[PDB]
Amino acid sequence: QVCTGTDMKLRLPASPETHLDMLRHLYQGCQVVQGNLELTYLPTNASLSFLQDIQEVQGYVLIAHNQVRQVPLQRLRIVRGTQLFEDNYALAVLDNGDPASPGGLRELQLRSLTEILKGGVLIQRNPQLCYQDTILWKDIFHKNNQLALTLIDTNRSRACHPCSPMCKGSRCWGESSEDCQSLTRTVCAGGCARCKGPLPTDCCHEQCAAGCTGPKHSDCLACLHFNHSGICELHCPALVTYNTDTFESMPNPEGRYTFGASCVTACPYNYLSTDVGSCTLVCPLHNQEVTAEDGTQRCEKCPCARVCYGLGMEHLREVRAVTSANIQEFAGCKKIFGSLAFLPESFDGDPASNTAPLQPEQLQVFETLEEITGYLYISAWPDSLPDLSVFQNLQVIRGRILHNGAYSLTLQGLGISWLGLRSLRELGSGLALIHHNTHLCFVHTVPWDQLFRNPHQALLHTANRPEDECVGEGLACHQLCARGHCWGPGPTQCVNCSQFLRGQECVEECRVLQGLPREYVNARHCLPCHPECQPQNGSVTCFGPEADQCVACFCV
Amino acid sequence: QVQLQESGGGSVQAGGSLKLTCAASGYIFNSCGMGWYRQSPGRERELVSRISGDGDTWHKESVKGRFTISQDNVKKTLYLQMNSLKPEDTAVYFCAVCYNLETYWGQGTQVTVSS
Ligand SMILES: *[C@@H]1O[C@H](CO)[C@@H](O[C@@H]2O[C@H](CO)[C@@H](O)[C@H](O)[C@H]2NC(C)=O)[C@H](O)[C@H]1NC(C)=O
């Protein structure tokens, strides 16, 4: 029911062939959009029925550069505007029109939208759009909306059918009788912020937003602040109460975490639980992340040890790419708080800022890297390097920050022939996008479903090297890779070994009983012997690597 | 009624400065944001600088550091101080005030930067 929005603004989707698939995966079944609902560059034939359940948007709504004529958001009741398009608009409808029937948005059909808490409305250059000038927009803006500057272009290249004759006051989102605008603010008695009618009895509880079906904080169409199990309330119950004599902290059995506009018993997967009682993706200031025995992580206020920040964090907040100017900042980092993006400028250099091209050998700085809390984005890569094995120790990309707000892993326009991300076992959130890598095989040998953690995730892929061109050249998983899962060719690229590991190579059998030198197995790895251990012709030989655990000769 | 009117437009060289004045008359106040829009020929009217109803200031990135928005509650005026002007700032500038959730507009004043 709760999903994450995007953060792409007007930027062009790199893969139009899969852009719509991404939106479907994000929003199918979703009712509450945490973040921004951005619907852009959609073609005339785009089926958008997967948006039909969206009821709340926490950030802004952007509908831009589409040729599709209808965007079905008829259940959207409230846009909270906690983020704003251009920092000013909760609703932006731009350039939806074409460069028999012409494309271009024809109606908004926001027939349930009765609440814009913060932000104005921007509607520009939509040549087929009607009814933006038959809506009393001031009714939708919340009583206390402090930023509602609004600019609505009403040039159109077609006649508009009048509102249905059943619409009171000639206000409607479209031509049908179901598109009449219901007023919930300007018709209220006693200046109450929202009502369901003209009398004082119709005033909503002040913790409601958007409207009501009755007088109580359980009759709201939306909560102004927090939904506490069907009750709209100003704040969630604290996780701690204080003993009334000592004021020592006591666990509160009714305590809840804040998550968007709701009170939850536990933070959802990939979110951090704070001591403040909030679910967050980025820890607040002066804090440190701690992993519990579950794998669940808590944020904790803090002599706080030094940390490796990636792009989008601290001094790298504005930095576009990993370059030769900042590459050394990641030396020895097991965990990068933030993201990594490799762009053409990373490896071309930039003479304007006198930034030298990033050399391939410098990418070895990531060999220690196990975890990226943000995303990994690679749109250029050294042609000499056949894979991404500089990240071969990377175990998880959390995706707490997502490229364009959607993608935790992006690989595009590269010359690599395989992935080589042989430790990658989790994409905590976001989609993977792998396209237009002309030489890249070993994409469908990866069990992507094992890496994902929620059903809104998927691999989107196109214009890589065709599966049959890879098969006809003999580029398949090694025989020792369990279930034909691998990240590249040979026995060092298996997801899971069929037998044993001697270091990085999957082998059929350790030299426990035969072969020289002898080895002992430990967690299905072939670790050797102390050389002064005489090889037993019959049985085992070593139980450890030192001369202590040694049979035939400190066995010196 | 209520009216907004801009003055102070003019023509300067690149690097010049101008101060636009938006004079409000009638019963109107900045309750839900006020600011300056600009519109070039063959281009959209777009927000440049803004003060919200609770006093938060915002500037379009291309004018950040060069434009200064201010107000005089006694005179009921909104100002846009423009320094280090660039040819790309050439446009008609409009003030807009949001009051009781309705947006009111001036007539616009021409600013021309030559280079
Ligand atoms: C607050 O959240 C509760 C979930 O606990 C919402 O309750 C659901 O409401 C819909 C329709 O209103 C029903 O179809 C569901 O069966 C309800 N579920 C439960 C568990 O009660 C409630 O609508 C929310 N209130 C808001 C957002 O104002």
Side-chain angles (χ1 to χ4, degrees), chain A residues 86-89 124-125 138 142 145-151 185, chain B residues 32-34 37 44-45 47 50 52-54 58 98 101-103:
Chain A
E86 306 291 356
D87 302 319
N88 283 287
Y89 303 109
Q124 291 185 308
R125 298 173 305 276
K138 80 178 180 177
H142 194 252
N145 192 336
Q146 301 291 291
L147 182 56
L149 287 165
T150 287
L151 165 69
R185 185 184 72 76
Chain B
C32 40
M34 67 187 172
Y37 286 73
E44 67 286 353
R45 189 182 300 193
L47 182 60
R50 163 272 277 167
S52 66
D54 62 347
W58 173 93
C98 179
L101 308 153
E102 311 185 85
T103 295

PDB file of all heavy atoms in Angstrom, chain A residues 86-89 124-125 138 142 145-151 185, chain B residues 32-34 37 44-45 47 50 52-54 58 98 101-103:
ATOM      1  N   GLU A  86      10.237  22.611  -8.169  1.00  0.00           N
ATOM      2  CA  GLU A  86      10.920  23.909  -8.176  1.00  0.00           C
ATOM      3  C   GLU A  86      10.821  24.600  -6.817  1.00  0.00           C
ATOM      4  O   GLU A  86      10.875  25.831  -6.729  1.00  0.00           O
ATOM      5  CB  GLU A  86      10.380  24.828  -9.277  1.00  0.00           C
ATOM      6  CG  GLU A  86      10.398  24.244 -10.679  1.00  0.00           C
ATOM      7  CD  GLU A  86      11.796  24.072 -11.243  1.00  0.00           C
ATOM      8  OE1 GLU A  86      12.773  24.483 -10.579  1.00  0.00           O
ATOM      9  OE2 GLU A  86      11.916  23.528 -12.361  1.00  0.00           O
ATOM     10  N   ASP A  87      10.675  23.805  -5.752  1.00  0.00           N
ATOM     11  CA  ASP A  87      10.513  24.295  -4.382  1.00  0.00           C
ATOM     12  C   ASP A  87       9.290  25.194  -4.214  1.00  0.00           C
ATOM     13  O   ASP A  87       9.222  25.978  -3.259  1.00  0.00           O
ATOM     14  CB  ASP A  87      11.759  25.044  -3.902  1.00  0.00           C
ATOM     15  CG  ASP A  87      13.007  24.195  -3.954  1.00  0.00           C
ATOM     16  OD1 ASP A  87      12.920  23.003  -3.603  1.00  0.00           O
ATOM     17  OD2 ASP A  87      14.072  24.723  -4.338  1.00  0.00           O
ATOM     18  N   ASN A  88       8.304  25.111  -5.107  1.00  0.00           N
ATOM     19  CA  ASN A  88       7.169  26.026  -5.008  1.00  0.00           C
ATOM     20  C   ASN A  88       5.818  25.420  -5.356  1.00  0.00           C
ATOM     21  O   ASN A  88       4.800  25.986  -4.946  1.00  0.00           O
ATOM     22  CB  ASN A  88       7.414  27.250  -5.896  1.00  0.00           C
ATOM     23  CG  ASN A  88       8.390  28.231  -5.265  1.00  0.00           C
ATOM     24  OD1 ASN A  88       8.052  28.935  -4.317  1.00  0.00           O
ATOM     25  ND2 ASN A  88       9.626  28.242  -5.761  1.00  0.00           N
ATOM     26  N   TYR A  89       5.747  24.294  -6.064  1.00  0.00           N
ATOM     27  CA  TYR A  89       4.482  23.791  -6.586  1.00  0.00           C
ATOM     28  C   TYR A  89       4.234  22.374  -6.098  1.00  0.00           C
ATOM     29  O   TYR A  89       5.079  21.493  -6.284  1.00  0.00           O
ATOM     30  CB  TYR A  89       4.468  23.838  -8.117  1.00  0.00           C
ATOM     31  CG  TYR A  89       4.709  25.226  -8.657  1.00  0.00           C
ATOM     32  CD1 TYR A  89       5.895  25.546  -9.296  1.00  0.00           C
ATOM     33  CD2 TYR A  89       3.749  26.222  -8.522  1.00  0.00           C
ATOM     34  CE1 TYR A  89       6.121  26.833  -9.798  1.00  0.00           C
ATOM     35  CE2 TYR A  89       3.967  27.511  -9.016  1.00  0.00           C
ATOM     36  CZ  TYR A  89       5.151  27.807  -9.653  1.00  0.00           C
ATOM     37  OH  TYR A  89       5.384  29.072 -10.151  1.00  0.00           O
ATOM     38  N   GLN A 124       1.140  24.616 -17.370  1.00  0.00           N
ATOM     39  CA  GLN A 124       1.623  25.378 -18.516  1.00  0.00           C
ATOM     40  C   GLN A 124       1.780  24.500 -19.748  1.00  0.00           C
ATOM     41  O   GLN A 124       2.267  23.367 -19.663  1.00  0.00           O
ATOM     42  CB  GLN A 124       2.963  26.066 -18.204  1.00  0.00           C
ATOM     43  CG  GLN A 124       2.841  27.195 -17.185  1.00  0.00           C
ATOM     44  CD  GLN A 124       4.138  27.946 -16.973  1.00  0.00           C
ATOM     45  OE1 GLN A 124       5.185  27.350 -16.716  1.00  0.00           O
ATOM     46  NE2 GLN A 124       4.079  29.267 -17.101  1.00  0.00           N
ATOM     47  N   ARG A 125       1.356  25.046 -20.891  1.00  0.00           N
ATOM     48  CA  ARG A 125       1.609  24.490 -22.219  1.00  0.00           C
ATOM     49  C   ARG A 125       1.063  23.067 -22.361  1.00  0.00           C
ATOM     50  O   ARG A 125       1.789  22.108 -22.638  1.00  0.00           O
ATOM     51  CB  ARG A 125       3.101  24.558 -22.565  1.00  0.00           C
ATOM     52  CG  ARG A 125       3.653  25.983 -22.609  1.00  0.00           C
ATOM     53  CD  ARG A 125       5.165  26.014 -22.776  1.00  0.00           C
ATOM     54  NE  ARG A 125       5.844  25.234 -21.748  1.00  0.00           N
ATOM     55  CZ  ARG A 125       6.134  25.688 -20.536  1.00  0.00           C
ATOM     56  NH1 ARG A 125       5.787  26.920 -20.184  1.00  0.00           N
ATOM     57  NH2 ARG A 125       6.753  24.905 -19.668  1.00  0.00           N
ATOM     58  N   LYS A 138      -8.685  27.504  -5.104  1.00  0.00           N
ATOM     59  CA  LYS A 138      -8.487  27.974  -3.738  1.00  0.00           C
ATOM     60  C   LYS A 138      -9.180  27.077  -2.725  1.00  0.00           C
ATOM     61  O   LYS A 138      -8.779  27.042  -1.558  1.00  0.00           O
ATOM     62  CB  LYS A 138      -8.969  29.419  -3.585  1.00  0.00           C
ATOM     63  CG  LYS A 138     -10.466  29.598  -3.417  1.00  0.00           C
ATOM     64  CD  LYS A 138     -10.784  31.075  -3.227  1.00  0.00           C
ATOM     65  CE  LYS A 138     -12.266  31.328  -3.041  1.00  0.00           C
ATOM     66  NZ  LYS A 138     -12.532  32.776  -2.798  1.00  0.00           N
ATOM     67  N   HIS A 142      -5.043  24.095   1.434  1.00  0.00           N
ATOM     68  CA  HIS A 142      -5.350  24.096   2.854  1.00  0.00           C
ATOM     69  C   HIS A 142      -5.417  25.521   3.383  1.00  0.00           C
ATOM     70  O   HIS A 142      -4.697  26.415   2.924  1.00  0.00           O
ATOM     71  CB  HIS A 142      -4.298  23.316   3.641  1.00  0.00           C
ATOM     72  CG  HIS A 142      -4.719  22.986   5.041  1.00  0.00           C
ATOM     73  ND1 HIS A 142      -4.184  23.612   6.145  1.00  0.00           N
ATOM     74  CD2 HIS A 142      -5.626  22.097   5.513  1.00  0.00           C
ATOM     75  CE1 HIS A 142      -4.741  23.123   7.239  1.00  0.00           C
ATOM     76  NE2 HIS A 142      -5.620  22.202   6.883  1.00  0.00           N
ATOM     77  N   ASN A 145      -2.047  26.807   4.186  1.00  0.00           N
ATOM     78  CA  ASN A 145      -1.003  26.709   3.172  1.00  0.00           C
ATOM     79  C   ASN A 145      -0.306  28.058   3.022  1.00  0.00           C
ATOM     80  O   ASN A 145      -0.931  29.050   2.640  1.00  0.00           O
ATOM     81  CB  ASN A 145      -1.617  26.257   1.846  1.00  0.00           C
ATOM     82  CG  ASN A 145      -0.576  25.859   0.812  1.00  0.00           C
ATOM     83  OD1 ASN A 145       0.577  26.293   0.860  1.00  0.00           O
ATOM     84  ND2 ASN A 145      -0.987  25.032  -0.142  1.00  0.00           N
ATOM     85  N   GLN A 146       0.985  28.096   3.344  1.00  0.00           N
ATOM     86  CA  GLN A 146       1.777  29.321   3.346  1.00  0.00           C
ATOM     87  C   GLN A 146       2.439  29.611   2.007  1.00  0.00           C
ATOM     88  O   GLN A 146       3.097  30.649   1.864  1.00  0.00           O
ATOM     89  CB  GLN A 146       2.864  29.244   4.422  1.00  0.00           C
ATOM     90  CG  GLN A 146       2.335  29.050   5.819  1.00  0.00           C
ATOM     91  CD  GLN A 146       1.607  30.273   6.318  1.00  0.00           C
ATOM     92  OE1 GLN A 146       2.216  31.314   6.564  1.00  0.00           O
ATOM     93  NE2 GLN A 146       0.292  30.161   6.456  1.00  0.00           N
ATOM     94  N   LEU A 147       2.314  28.715   1.039  1.00  0.00           N
ATOM     95  CA  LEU A 147       2.998  28.889  -0.238  1.00  0.00           C
ATOM     96  C   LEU A 147       2.069  28.307  -1.302  1.00  0.00           C
ATOM     97  O   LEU A 147       2.090  27.109  -1.571  1.00  0.00           O
ATOM     98  CB  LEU A 147       4.365  28.219  -0.242  1.00  0.00           C
ATOM     99  CG  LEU A 147       5.184  28.387  -1.526  1.00  0.00           C
ATOM    100  CD1 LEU A 147       5.355  29.865  -1.866  1.00  0.00           C
ATOM    101  CD2 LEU A 147       6.539  27.715  -1.378  1.00  0.00           C
ATOM    102  N   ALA A 148       1.231  29.164  -1.869  1.00  0.00           N
ATOM    103  CA  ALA A 148       0.236  28.690  -2.818  1.00  0.00           C
ATOM    104  C   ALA A 148       0.189  29.574  -4.054  1.00  0.00           C
ATOM    105  O   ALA A 148      -0.857  29.638  -4.718  1.00  0.00           O
ATOM    106  CB  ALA A 148      -1.152  28.609  -2.161  1.00  0.00           C
ATOM    107  N   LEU A 149       1.285  30.273  -4.359  1.00  0.00           N
ATOM    108  CA  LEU A 149       1.404  30.979  -5.624  1.00  0.00           C
ATOM    109  C   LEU A 149       1.081  30.022  -6.758  1.00  0.00           C
ATOM    110  O   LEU A 149       1.556  28.883  -6.783  1.00  0.00           O
ATOM    111  CB  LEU A 149       2.811  31.560  -5.790  1.00  0.00           C
ATOM    112  CG  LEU A 149       3.108  32.774  -4.906  1.00  0.00           C
ATOM    113  CD1 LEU A 149       4.600  33.077  -4.845  1.00  0.00           C
ATOM    114  CD2 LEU A 149       2.325  33.988  -5.405  1.00  0.00           C
ATOM    115  N   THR A 150       0.236  30.479  -7.672  1.00  0.00           N
ATOM    116  CA  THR A 150      -0.357  29.602  -8.660  1.00  0.00           C
ATOM    117  C   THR A 150      -0.406  30.305 -10.006  1.00  0.00           C
ATOM    118  O   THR A 150      -0.713  31.497 -10.088  1.00  0.00           O
ATOM    119  CB  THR A 150      -1.747  29.153  -8.193  1.00  0.00           C
ATOM    120  OG1 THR A 150      -1.578  28.206  -7.131  1.00  0.00           O
ATOM    121  CG2 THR A 150      -2.535  28.517  -9.320  1.00  0.00           C
ATOM    122  N   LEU A 151      -0.068  29.558 -11.054  1.00  0.00           N
ATOM    123  CA  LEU A 151       0.008  30.091 -12.409  1.00  0.00           C
ATOM    124  C   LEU A 151      -0.539  29.026 -13.345  1.00  0.00           C
ATOM    125  O   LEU A 151       0.050  27.947 -13.481  1.00  0.00           O
ATOM    126  CB  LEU A 151       1.446  30.477 -12.767  1.00  0.00           C
ATOM    127  CG  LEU A 151       1.754  30.723 -14.239  1.00  0.00           C
ATOM    128  CD1 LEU A 151       1.068  31.986 -14.709  1.00  0.00           C
ATOM    129  CD2 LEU A 151       3.253  30.836 -14.420  1.00  0.00           C
ATOM    130  N   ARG A 185     -13.793  23.380   1.750  1.00  0.00           N
ATOM    131  CA  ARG A 185     -13.201  24.425   2.579  1.00  0.00           C
ATOM    132  C   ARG A 185     -13.968  25.740   2.489  1.00  0.00           C
ATOM    133  O   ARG A 185     -14.307  26.333   3.517  1.00  0.00           O
ATOM    134  CB  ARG A 185     -11.737  24.665   2.196  1.00  0.00           C
ATOM    135  CG  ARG A 185     -11.042  25.655   3.123  1.00  0.00           C
ATOM    136  CD  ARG A 185      -9.613  25.970   2.696  1.00  0.00           C
ATOM    137  NE  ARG A 185      -9.557  26.799   1.498  1.00  0.00           N
ATOM    138  CZ  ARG A 185      -9.815  28.102   1.480  1.00  0.00           C
ATOM    139  NH1 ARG A 185     -10.148  28.729   2.597  1.00  0.00           N
ATOM    140  NH2 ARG A 185      -9.735  28.783   0.344  1.00  0.00           N
TER     141      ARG A 185
ATOM    142  N   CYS B  32       0.032  33.769   1.652  1.00  0.00           N
ATOM    143  CA  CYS B  32       0.437  32.469   1.120  1.00  0.00           C
ATOM    144  C   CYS B  32       1.525  32.619   0.058  1.00  0.00           C
ATOM    145  O   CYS B  32       1.574  31.860  -0.917  1.00  0.00           O
ATOM    146  CB  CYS B  32      -0.766  31.692   0.569  1.00  0.00           C
ATOM    147  SG  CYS B  32      -1.999  32.655  -0.356  1.00  0.00           S
ATOM    148  N   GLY B  33       2.424  33.572   0.243  1.00  0.00           N
ATOM    149  CA  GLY B  33       3.572  33.703  -0.644  1.00  0.00           C
ATOM    150  C   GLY B  33       3.442  34.881  -1.594  1.00  0.00           C
ATOM    151  O   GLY B  33       2.352  35.201  -2.082  1.00  0.00           O
ATOM    152  N   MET B  34       4.567  35.535  -1.867  1.00  0.00           N
ATOM    153  CA  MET B  34       4.608  36.564  -2.895  1.00  0.00           C
ATOM    154  C   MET B  34       5.980  36.535  -3.542  1.00  0.00           C
ATOM    155  O   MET B  34       6.963  36.099  -2.934  1.00  0.00           O
ATOM    156  CB  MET B  34       4.310  37.960  -2.332  1.00  0.00           C
ATOM    157  CG  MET B  34       5.374  38.487  -1.380  1.00  0.00           C
ATOM    158  SD  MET B  34       4.894  40.036  -0.572  1.00  0.00           S
ATOM    159  CE  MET B  34       6.237  40.198   0.595  1.00  0.00           C
ATOM    160  N   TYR B  37       7.848  36.912 -10.993  1.00  0.00           N
ATOM    161  CA  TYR B  37       7.906  36.075 -12.172  1.00  0.00           C
ATOM    162  C   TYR B  37       8.540  36.879 -13.292  1.00  0.00           C
ATOM    163  O   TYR B  37       8.490  38.113 -13.289  1.00  0.00           O
ATOM    164  CB  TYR B  37       6.503  35.615 -12.582  1.00  0.00           C
ATOM    165  CG  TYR B  37       5.923  34.553 -11.685  1.00  0.00           C
ATOM    166  CD1 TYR B  37       5.482  34.854 -10.399  1.00  0.00           C
ATOM    167  CD2 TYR B  37       5.804  33.247 -12.129  1.00  0.00           C
ATOM    168  CE1 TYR B  37       4.938  33.864  -9.576  1.00  0.00           C
ATOM    169  CE2 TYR B  37       5.268  32.259 -11.327  1.00  0.00           C
ATOM    170  CZ  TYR B  37       4.839  32.568 -10.052  1.00  0.00           C
ATOM    171  OH  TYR B  37       4.313  31.564  -9.267  1.00  0.00           O
ATOM    172  N   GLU B  44       8.137  30.976 -21.323  1.00  0.00           N
ATOM    173  CA  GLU B  44       7.156  30.894 -20.255  1.00  0.00           C
ATOM    174  C   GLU B  44       7.371  31.987 -19.218  1.00  0.00           C
ATOM    175  O   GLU B  44       8.481  32.492 -19.027  1.00  0.00           O
ATOM    176  CB  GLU B  44       7.230  29.532 -19.565  1.00  0.00           C
ATOM    177  CG  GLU B  44       8.514  29.273 -18.777  1.00  0.00           C
ATOM    178  CD  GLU B  44       9.719  29.003 -19.663  1.00  0.00           C
ATOM    179  OE1 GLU B  44       9.545  28.883 -20.895  1.00  0.00           O
ATOM    180  OE2 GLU B  44      10.842  28.909 -19.123  1.00  0.00           O
ATOM    181  N   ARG B  45       6.284  32.354 -18.553  1.00  0.00           N
ATOM    182  CA  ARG B  45       6.379  33.081 -17.298  1.00  0.00           C
ATOM    183  C   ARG B  45       6.807  32.115 -16.197  1.00  0.00           C
ATOM    184  O   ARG B  45       6.181  31.068 -16.001  1.00  0.00           O
ATOM    185  CB  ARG B  45       5.035  33.720 -16.969  1.00  0.00           C
ATOM    186  CG  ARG B  45       5.060  34.670 -15.803  1.00  0.00           C
ATOM    187  CD  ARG B  45       3.669  35.204 -15.526  1.00  0.00           C
ATOM    188  NE  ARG B  45       3.111  35.920 -16.670  1.00  0.00           N
ATOM    189  CZ  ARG B  45       2.030  36.691 -16.607  1.00  0.00           C
ATOM    190  NH1 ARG B  45       1.400  36.846 -15.449  1.00  0.00           N
ATOM    191  NH2 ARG B  45       1.582  37.311 -17.695  1.00  0.00           N
ATOM    192  N   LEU B  47       8.753  31.589 -12.132  1.00  0.00           N
ATOM    193  CA  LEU B  47       9.052  32.201 -10.845  1.00  0.00           C
ATOM    194  C   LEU B  47      10.557  32.376 -10.669  1.00  0.00           C
ATOM    195  O   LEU B  47      11.340  31.465 -10.957  1.00  0.00           O
ATOM    196  CB  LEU B  47       8.470  31.356  -9.715  1.00  0.00           C
ATOM    197  CG  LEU B  47       8.648  31.861  -8.286  1.00  0.00           C
ATOM    198  CD1 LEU B  47       7.998  33.223  -8.095  1.00  0.00           C
ATOM    199  CD2 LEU B  47       8.053  30.852  -7.326  1.00  0.00           C
ATOM    200  N   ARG B  50      10.932  34.585  -4.385  1.00  0.00           N
ATOM    201  CA  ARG B  50       9.692  34.347  -3.668  1.00  0.00           C
ATOM    202  C   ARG B  50       9.938  34.453  -2.167  1.00  0.00           C
ATOM    203  O   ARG B  50      10.984  34.028  -1.666  1.00  0.00           O
ATOM    204  CB  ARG B  50       9.129  32.970  -4.053  1.00  0.00           C
ATOM    205  CG  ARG B  50       8.065  32.375  -3.130  1.00  0.00           C
ATOM    206  CD  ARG B  50       8.655  31.549  -1.987  1.00  0.00           C
ATOM    207  NE  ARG B  50       8.977  30.172  -2.339  1.00  0.00           N
ATOM    208  CZ  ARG B  50       9.711  29.367  -1.578  1.00  0.00           C
ATOM    209  NH1 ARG B  50      10.215  29.807  -0.426  1.00  0.00           N
ATOM    210  NH2 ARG B  50       9.957  28.131  -1.971  1.00  0.00           N
ATOM    211  N   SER B  52       7.606  33.238   1.125  1.00  0.00           N
ATOM    212  CA  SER B  52       6.371  32.565   1.486  1.00  0.00           C
ATOM    213  C   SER B  52       5.637  33.349   2.576  1.00  0.00           C
ATOM    214  O   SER B  52       6.155  34.308   3.156  1.00  0.00           O
ATOM    215  CB  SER B  52       6.648  31.135   1.948  1.00  0.00           C
ATOM    216  OG  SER B  52       7.382  31.127   3.159  1.00  0.00           O
ATOM    217  N   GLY B  53       4.407  32.921   2.858  1.00  0.00           N
ATOM    218  CA  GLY B  53       3.607  33.576   3.878  1.00  0.00           C
ATOM    219  C   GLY B  53       4.240  33.576   5.253  1.00  0.00           C
ATOM    220  O   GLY B  53       3.900  34.428   6.079  1.00  0.00           O
ATOM    221  N   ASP B  54       5.152  32.641   5.525  1.00  0.00           N
ATOM    222  CA  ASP B  54       5.853  32.593   6.800  1.00  0.00           C
ATOM    223  C   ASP B  54       7.310  33.037   6.680  1.00  0.00           C
ATOM    224  O   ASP B  54       8.117  32.758   7.573  1.00  0.00           O
ATOM    225  CB  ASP B  54       5.753  31.194   7.419  1.00  0.00           C
ATOM    226  CG  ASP B  54       6.408  30.115   6.568  1.00  0.00           C
ATOM    227  OD1 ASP B  54       6.734  30.377   5.391  1.00  0.00           O
ATOM    228  OD2 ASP B  54       6.586  28.991   7.086  1.00  0.00           O
ATOM    229  N   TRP B  58      13.240  32.172  -1.331  1.00  0.00           N
ATOM    230  CA  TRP B  58      13.746  31.252  -2.339  1.00  0.00           C
ATOM    231  C   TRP B  58      14.107  32.034  -3.591  1.00  0.00           C
ATOM    232  O   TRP B  58      13.427  33.000  -3.947  1.00  0.00           O
ATOM    233  CB  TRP B  58      12.711  30.178  -2.676  1.00  0.00           C
ATOM    234  CG  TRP B  58      13.077  29.284  -3.834  1.00  0.00           C
ATOM    235  CD1 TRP B  58      13.718  28.077  -3.768  1.00  0.00           C
ATOM    236  CD2 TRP B  58      12.802  29.514  -5.221  1.00  0.00           C
ATOM    237  NE1 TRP B  58      13.867  27.549  -5.028  1.00  0.00           N
ATOM    238  CE2 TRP B  58      13.313  28.410  -5.938  1.00  0.00           C
ATOM    239  CE3 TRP B  58      12.185  30.550  -5.929  1.00  0.00           C
ATOM    240  CZ2 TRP B  58      13.223  28.313  -7.327  1.00  0.00           C
ATOM    241  CZ3 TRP B  58      12.094  30.449  -7.310  1.00  0.00           C
ATOM    242  CH2 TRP B  58      12.603  29.337  -7.992  1.00  0.00           C
ATOM    243  N   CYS B  98       0.048  36.099  -3.207  1.00  0.00           N
ATOM    244  CA  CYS B  98      -0.986  35.129  -2.877  1.00  0.00           C
ATOM    245  C   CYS B  98      -1.626  35.569  -1.566  1.00  0.00           C
ATOM    246  O   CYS B  98      -0.940  35.681  -0.545  1.00  0.00           O
ATOM    247  CB  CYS B  98      -0.402  33.715  -2.773  1.00  0.00           C
ATOM    248  SG  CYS B  98      -1.579  32.390  -2.349  1.00  0.00           S
ATOM    249  N   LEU B 101      -5.323  32.542  -0.442  1.00  0.00           N
ATOM    250  CA  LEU B 101      -5.151  31.426  -1.364  1.00  0.00           C
ATOM    251  C   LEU B 101      -5.509  31.778  -2.797  1.00  0.00           C
ATOM    252  O   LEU B 101      -5.728  30.875  -3.611  1.00  0.00           O
ATOM    253  CB  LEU B 101      -5.945  30.203  -0.896  1.00  0.00           C
ATOM    254  CG  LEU B 101      -5.541  29.951   0.560  1.00  0.00           C
ATOM    255  CD1 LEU B 101      -6.625  29.261   1.365  1.00  0.00           C
ATOM    256  CD2 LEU B 101      -4.198  29.195   0.606  1.00  0.00           C
ATOM    257  N   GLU B 102      -5.567  33.064  -3.135  1.00  0.00           N
ATOM    258  CA  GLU B 102      -5.740  33.503  -4.510  1.00  0.00           C
ATOM    259  C   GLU B 102      -4.517  34.299  -4.932  1.00  0.00           C
ATOM    260  O   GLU B 102      -3.953  35.060  -4.139  1.00  0.00           O
ATOM    261  CB  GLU B 102      -6.999  34.348  -4.676  1.00  0.00           C
ATOM    262  CG  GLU B 102      -8.220  33.709  -4.056  1.00  0.00           C
ATOM    263  CD  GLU B 102      -9.484  34.492  -4.322  1.00  0.00           C
ATOM    264  OE1 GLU B 102     -10.100  34.300  -5.391  1.00  0.00           O
ATOM    265  OE2 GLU B 102      -9.853  35.312  -3.462  1.00  0.00           O
ATOM    266  N   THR B 103      -4.111  34.126  -6.180  1.00  0.00           N
ATOM    267  CA  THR B 103      -2.919  34.775  -6.694  1.00  0.00           C
ATOM    268  C   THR B 103      -3.321  36.019  -7.474  1.00  0.00           C
ATOM    269  O   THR B 103      -4.160  35.949  -8.378  1.00  0.00           O
ATOM    270  CB  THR B 103      -2.101  33.812  -7.551  1.00  0.00           C
ATOM    271  OG1 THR B 103      -1.615  32.746  -6.721  1.00  0.00           O
ATOM    272  CG2 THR B 103      -0.925  34.550  -8.183  1.00  0.00           C
TER     273      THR B 103
END
